[PDB]
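dumping the sequnces here before i forget
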Amino acid sequence: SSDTTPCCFAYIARPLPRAHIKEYFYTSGKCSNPAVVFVTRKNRQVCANPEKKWVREYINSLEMS
Amino acid sequence: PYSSDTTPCCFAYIARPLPRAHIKEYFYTSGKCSNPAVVFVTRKNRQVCANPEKKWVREYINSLEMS
Ligand SMILES: O=C(O)C1=C[C@H](O)[C@@H](OS(=O)(=O)O)[C@H](O[C@H]2[C@H](O)[C@@H](NS(=O)(=O)O)[C@@H](O)O[C@@H]2COS(=O)(=O)O)O1
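..and the predicted 3d for all of it:
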């Protein structure tokens, strides 16, 4: 029920704890900066750099379900 | 330096004025966003993007600041 789009303007500096992430999604291409959003169990939407190794690894684990 | 949590931005503006009585709050999207924008929060808690340059948008804001 919202017309807004979540975008990222900064990336979290250190790897987020894997245990508390329930899913992820890529921010819209409309956004100026590319980004991966890790959603935590407390519904925090954390921005991360798609080029980081840990980020790609977390995505892989979330993709294997 | 800035929050690493997602921030809402607008990429489209509602074409015509929303019913004034259905609006309870408003807020400008971050200056970090590509487009300047006003987001009106309706009483059903929906969020609508609007153009700050529009006359009705500025008037709605002036009204909201009174209530
Ligand atoms: O209380 C807020 O509404 C608010 C809190 C956060 O500090 C930040 O949210 S955000 O990281 O998702 O954007 C935001 O603070 C500022 C925001 O940084 C400003 N944009 S900027 O000048 O480009 O940096 C602008 O949008 O105003 C926000 C709130 O102003 S404040 O209430 O005085 O802090 O919003």
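The interface with chain B takes residues 1-13, 27-28, 30-32, 37, 44-48 of chain A (CB under 8 Å).
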